Amino acid sequence: VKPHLRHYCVVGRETPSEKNPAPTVYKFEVFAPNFVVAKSRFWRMMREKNKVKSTHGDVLSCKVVKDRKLAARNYSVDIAYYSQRCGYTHMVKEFRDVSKAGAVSQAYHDLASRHRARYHNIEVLGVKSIPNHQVKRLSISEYHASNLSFPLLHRRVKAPRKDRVVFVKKNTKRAVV
Amino acid sequence: NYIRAGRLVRIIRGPRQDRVGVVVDIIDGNRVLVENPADKKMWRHVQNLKNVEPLKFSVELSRNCSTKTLKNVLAEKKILEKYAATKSARRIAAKRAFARSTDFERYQLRVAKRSRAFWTRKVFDENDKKKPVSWHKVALKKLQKNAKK
Amino acid sequence: HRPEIIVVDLKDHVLGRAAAIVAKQLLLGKKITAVRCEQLTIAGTEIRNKIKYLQFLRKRKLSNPKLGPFHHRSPSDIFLRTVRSMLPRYTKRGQKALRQLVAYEGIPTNVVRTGGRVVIPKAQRHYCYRSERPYTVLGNMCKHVGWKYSDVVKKLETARVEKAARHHKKTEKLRAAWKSARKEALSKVSKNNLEVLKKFGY
Amino acid sequence: EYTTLRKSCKPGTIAIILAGRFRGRRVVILKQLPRNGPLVISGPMKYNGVPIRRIDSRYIIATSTKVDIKNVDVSGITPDIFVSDARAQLQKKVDAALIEAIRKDPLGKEKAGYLHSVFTIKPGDAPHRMRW
Amino acid sequence: VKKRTKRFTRHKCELFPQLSSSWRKPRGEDSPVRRRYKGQKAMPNKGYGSDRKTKYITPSGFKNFPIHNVQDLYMLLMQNRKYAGVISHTVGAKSRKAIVRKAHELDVRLING
RNA sequence: CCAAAACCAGCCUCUACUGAGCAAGAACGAGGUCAUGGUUUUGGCGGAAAUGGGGUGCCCCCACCCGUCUUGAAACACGGACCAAG
RNA sequence: GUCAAAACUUAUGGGCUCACGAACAAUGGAUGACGCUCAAGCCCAAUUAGUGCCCAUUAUUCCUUUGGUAAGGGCGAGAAAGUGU
RNA sequence: CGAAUCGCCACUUCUCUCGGCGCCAAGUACCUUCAUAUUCACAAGA
Ligand SMILES: [Mg+2]
Ligand SMILES: [Mg+2]
Ligand SMILES: [Mg+2]
C-alpha cells in the first residue's frame, strides 16, 4: 500500500514578543499520517527542545514534501524510540524502499512489531537515502546485486475478487459454490 | 521462472488487472517497480510480488533502467507482441472479450458453439462407424452374442 | 432421482477451515457430501494433535460416561463433530443442516462415479499452511487414537483408484475421438463462426 | 406526448422479455405508446411467436442491438387498439415490414436468428456481470 | 392502522387461572416487566395511543353510538356518515324490529341490525 | 381488495490551490425510494373474494419464577398447589 | 472463519511467532465453542490499494401518541371562545 | 397428490502436482408453429 506516513515539514516559531522580538524559525521534518499530527509532533519537539509550547508558537508551514522520484533505493532511517522495557534506543536500521516516507513508515511497522512501540514513542532522527555500499546491514545487501534473480516460490494465487469461488470441481475451474 | 529485472510480469488482481509489464527494478523481496510503455496505465509503479505473475518472457536488462531505454529494448524484441501470441495471453483477452461482450455477441457465439458442437457430433457420428461408442461399439460387439444365437 | 448434492472432496484441506466453510453452506441449504475425511489435514505435528485429541478423549462424565461426551474416532465422524460445532446444533435449523452433510472416509462407491467432486480453495492445505511447517493428516492421527478402519479405507481407496484408472484408459480411445472430432469440427462449415470462435479464444 | 422511457430503450431495439408469458424472448421494440406508456414490443411472431403486444419498460432488458426500423410504419399501433381479424391483419401488415427492416442490415441474418433466441439464466450465469 | 393489536395482558396471567388477562402495572423491584427487560411483556404507555383522527373508528368507518329506542335514531339523522348506531344489547327483539325498520328508512347505519 | 408501472415533488445515494499532491470546490449524468407527498393509469381477485381479528402449530429469534427485605435476588434467602368469597 | 449480522477466510499491507497466542491439585472442560498456524495469533497500518462492512432503545429523518402551567393562526361534514371529553 | 426444488452427461464422474454440452431449426440455412395468456404477478411449463 501507499505509505502509511506522509512526509511533512512543519515550520514554526515561538510567537513574537518584546521578550523575543525576532524568534528563531524552526524547520522540522516529520513523518505523520496527516498534518494535524505532524503539526502536533512538531509542537512536541518545540517544548521538548525549545521550551516553546503550542499556545505560544505558530506553525508557519504544514506542507507535505514531494517524493524524490520513484526508483527503488535504499534508506538509512535513524529511529529513537521508547519503552518501559527500553527507555531510549537510538537505532539506525536500514530499509529498502522507494521513498523516505515509505522507508519510515516501514520503519514504524518494523519497530512496532520487534518492539511493542506505538507511533508516539518513536521519533525519526533522519532518513538519508544510502548508496549501495554504505549499508552495513546484511539483509538489504542481498538485494544490491544488479544480477539478482529469485523465484516467487509456493505462491498463494487468490483469484481476482470478481472470480473467487467457494466450491470448484476438482481438476477443473468450473465453479460450484 | 525467476523474477528479476527485465522479467515480464503479468499484473493479477489490481486495478490494472490483465496488464503486463517488465520488472524494471526489484525493491525488496516483496515488491518491484513494474513498467510498460506499450500500455497507457503501466507507468512505473510499485507492484507487490504477491500481485504479479511472472511470465516466461523476460528481456535482458539493467536495474533502475530508464523508461525510454525500455520503450527501446522491448521494441527490439517485441516481447509484448510475442506475448499476446500465446494461448496464455489469448485466454486472458478471450475472457476479457466475453465479459466485455454485448448480448448479441453472446448469441453470435452460442450459434458457433453449437455450430461446432453440432459438427463435433456430425464428425463423430461419421466416425461412429469406427468404434468406440456405447451406441455403436457396444452394438457391434453386442450383435456378436446375437450371431451366436 | 438424486437431490442437488455436491460432494466435496476433502483431501488435503485444513480441517477447521473446510469445516467452517462447509458448515456455512449447510446453513445456506447446500446438501454437501464430504469424502476422504481421512485426508483432512491439521496444522502441527501429529503428536500435537494426538495430544489435543487425547485431551478430548480425557473428558467424560464421571457420573456416567455412557451419556458423556462421545469421542468418535472416525475421521468422518470427527469431521461431522467439527462441523456440528460450527452450526446451531440445538435449533432445528442447524440440527437439520448437520444431517444434510454426509461424511465418508475415502470415497464410497455410491458417491464415486456420481459426478465431479468439488474442492474448497479457501480450505486447501497449500493455501493455508506455510508449506514447510509440519502438518497432521487427519486419518493418520486418528489411527493412533482408535480408528480401526484406517487400513480398511486404504485398501478401498486403492481399489477405487486402480479401478478409476483402468476406466480412464478404457475411455482413452473415446476421449481421443471427441478431441479429434472436435478439432476437425472447426474445419467444418462453421466459417463465420470460426471467427466468432477465434475471438473469445475457442 | 411525454416520455421518460429510458435512452437504452429505443424503437427498433432488440429487447429481452423478463416477465410475463414470453420470458427470455428477444423482441424488437416497435414503439412507445402515445403517453409515457408501456412499450409495444413485437416478436415478430414470424420468428419467436411473440404477438404485437404491450410491455412495460421495467419488464424487458433493452439490448444494445437494434434495427433501423424508422422505415417501418408502426402507426397502427395506438393505445385504442388495446384473435380478431382486425388485429391479426395488423401484425401481418407490420411483422412483414418489421421483418424486412431486419433484412436490410448487414449482419441481418443473425438478427433473424438472434430473435429466434430465447434467454435463460443458466446455472453459473451472472447477468449482473453481463453487459448486453 | 393500529399501533398495537395485542392486548397488554397482566404478567403471568397465563400461569394463574384466577388472574384476569386485564392489565395491572407490575410492581416490585425485581419485576422483569417493569424493569422492562427486552424479552418480557410490554407495558401500556402514551406511545401506544392510536392515531387521533382514526381513533374510535370501527372498521366499518363509523364511530359507534349507543342506541336504545327509535327516538335515538334521529340523534344520528344528520350525522349518519359519522356515527353508527349500535343498539343496546337489552332492547327487546320487539323494539329492535322498530329501531331497525326505522334505522333503514332513515339512512343511519346500525352495527347490529 | 391485491398488485404492477409511470408523473411531479420531496429525499437520498452515486475548480482551486499546491509541488504528481491537498487541508480542495462544484458540475453533468444516472439510480434508489411512498413505512414520503400529491397525480391517476393498468391488470389480478370479486355464492364467495378480500382486509382485519380470533384460534391452533410450526419456524427463526428474544426471554432467569414471581412477591419480598436488601448495596446486591435467578439465587443454595424468605412467602408461593388450585380456585371461589372475603 | 463457523456458531453470528458482517472481510462468501478483504488487503494488489509490514513485521514477528511453532507452543503457545487472542481491557476492566484434587467430579471432565473450557481464547465462549469449535477450530485457527503464509492465523481465524501478536504488533502495526489499512479499506479495495503505489490508481470497506455489520450490529443499538443511540444520532439524524419520517409517521403516530402523549405532555408542555409551549408557539402561532382560526372559529360530503364540521367550524364549540375552549384546562380536562 | 395440489404441491417447494429448475442444468445435464459413461467428453467431468482417475490419480498426482475453460471437462463437454445445454440456453429455441439435431443447426447457422430462419425453413418455421406461437397472439385473446389480452403490460409483473409460483414457469399456466419441466
Ligand atoms: Mg444482606
Ligand atoms: Mg455470517
Ligand atoms: Mg408452477
Can you spell out the DSSP letters for D56-116? -GGGEEEEEEE--TTSS--TT--GGG---HHHHHHHHHHHHHHHHHHHHSTTHHHHHHHTT
Residue B48: all three cell numbers together: 507487490
- What radius of gyration do chain A's Cα atoms show? 22
CB contact under 8 A, D129 and A174: no
Q: Give the containing element (helix H, strand E) for B32.
A: strand B31-35
Give E79's contacts (C-beta < 8 A, 6+ positions apart): none
Identify the CA nearest to E36 among candidates E13, E11, E4. Answer: E11
Helix (H, G, I), strand (E, B) or coil at A93: coil
Separation of CA C7 and ligand 3 centre (Å): 29
- List strand G contacts in E 83-112 (CB < 7 A): none
Q: Is the CB of C91 under 7 A from strand G?
A: yes
Residue E36 and residue E23: Cα distance in Å, rounded? 15
Residue A122 CA to residue B26 CA, distance in Å, equals 29
Closest alpha carbon to C101 in C177, C200, C183, C25: C25
Q: How many other C-beta atoms lie within 10 A of the C-beta of residue C103?
A: 24
Q: How was this structure determined?
A: cryo-EM
Query: In chain A, which residues from 144 to 163 place their CB closer than 7 Å to nucleic acid strand G?
Result: 154-156, 158, 160-161
Distances from the Cα of C122 to the Cα of A170, A171, B136, C19, C128, angstroms: 13, 16, 44, 11, 8
Distance (angstroms) between ligand 2 centre and the Cα of A159 equals: 22
B10 touches strand G (CB under 7 A): no
Asked if residues A92 and A80 have their Cβ atoms less than 8 Å apart, the reply is no
Chains contacting A (3+ CB pairs below 8 angstroms) = B, C, D
Q: Could you tell me the maximum CA-CA distance found in chain E, to the nearest angstrom?
A: 60
Closest approach of D114 to chain B, Cα-based (Å): 6
> Is B45:B19 a contact under the CB 8 Å cutoff?
no
Chain A stretch 145-164, residues whose beta carbon is closer than 8 A to a beta carbon of chain C: 154, 156
- What is the pairing mode between strands C31-32 and C5-6? parallel
d(CA C163, CA C107): 13
B96 C-beta less than 7 Å away from strand G: no
Which of B101, B119, B128 to mutate to probe the C interface, most C CBs <10 Å? B119
C-alpha cell of A122?
A: 518513536
Which of C112, C119, C132 is the mutation pick for testing A, counting most A CBs within 10 A?
C119
B69 touching chain D per CB within 8 A:
no
Cβ of D58 near strand F (distance < 7 A): yes
Q: Do A162 and D129 touch (CB under 8 A)?
A: yes
The CA-atom distances, in angstroms, between D28 and each of C171, D37, E6 are 47, 17, 54
- Nearest alpha carbon to residue C12 among C148, C174, C126: C126
Cβ pair D117:B108 closer than 8 A: no
Asked if D129 is an interface residue toward chain A (Cβ–Cβ < 8 A), one would say yes
The x, y and z cell numbers of residue E24, run together, are 395491572
Whether any strand F atom is under 7 angstroms from the Cβ of E88: the reply reads: no
Q: How many CB atoms lie within 10 A of CB A9?
A: 15
Integer distance in angstroms from CA A32 to C1' F22? 15
The residue among A44, A5, A4 whose CA lies nearest residue A26 is: A44
- Cβ atoms D11, D31 nearer than 8 A: yes
Beta bridge partners of D17: D60
Q: Is E in contact with B (3 or more beta carbon pairs below 8 Å)?
A: no
CB-facing half-sphere around the CA of A112: CA atoms within 13 A: 9
Interchain pair C6, A167: CB under 8 A: yes
CB < 8 Å & 24+ apart, contacts of C153-161: C153/C38, C153/C105, C153/C106, C156/C106, C157/C36, C157/C38, C157/C106, C157/C107, C160/C106, C160/C107, C160/C109, C160/C112
Strands A75-80 and D60-66: unpaired
Residue A166 is classified by DSSP as: S
Put the strands of the sheet holding B20-26 in their side by side order.
Answer: B45-48, B31-35, B20-26, B8-11, B52-53
CA distance D10 to D98: 15
- Chains B and D form CB pairs within 8 A to the count of 34
Which are the contacts of C80, defined by CB distance < 8 A and separation ≥ 6? C72, C98, C101, C103
Contact with chain B for residue D113, Cβ under 8 A: yes
DSSP secondary structure of B104-146 = HHHHHHHHHHHHHHHHHHHHHHHGGGSS--TTTHHHHHHHHHH
Q: What angle do CA E47, E48, E51 make, to 5 degrees?
A: 95
> What span, in angstroms and rounded, lies between the C-alpha atoms of B27 and E63?
84
Is residue C108's beta carbon less than 7 angstroms from any atom in nucleic acid strand G? Answer: no
Strands (E), C21-176: 31-32, 41-43, 118-119, 135-137
Instruction: Give the CA A1 to C1' G15 distance in Å.
Output: 15
Q: Is residue B113 within 8 Å of residue C190, measured between CB atoms?
A: no
Are C127 and C175 contacting, i.e. CB atoms less than 8 angstroms apart?
A: no
Cell of C162: 486402480
Residues in a beta bridge with B8: B22
**Which neighbouring-strand residues pair with B11?**
B52
Beta bridge partners of D13: D66
Residues C108, C41: contact at Cβ < 8 Å? no
Q: State the residue for C-alpha cell 414503439.
A: D31
Beta-carbon count within 10 A of C190 CB? 21
Measured in angstroms, the resolution is 2.5
Closest ligand to the CA of C27:
2
- Burial, D65: exposed, middle or buried (Cβ in 10 Å; 0-12, 13-18, 19+)? buried
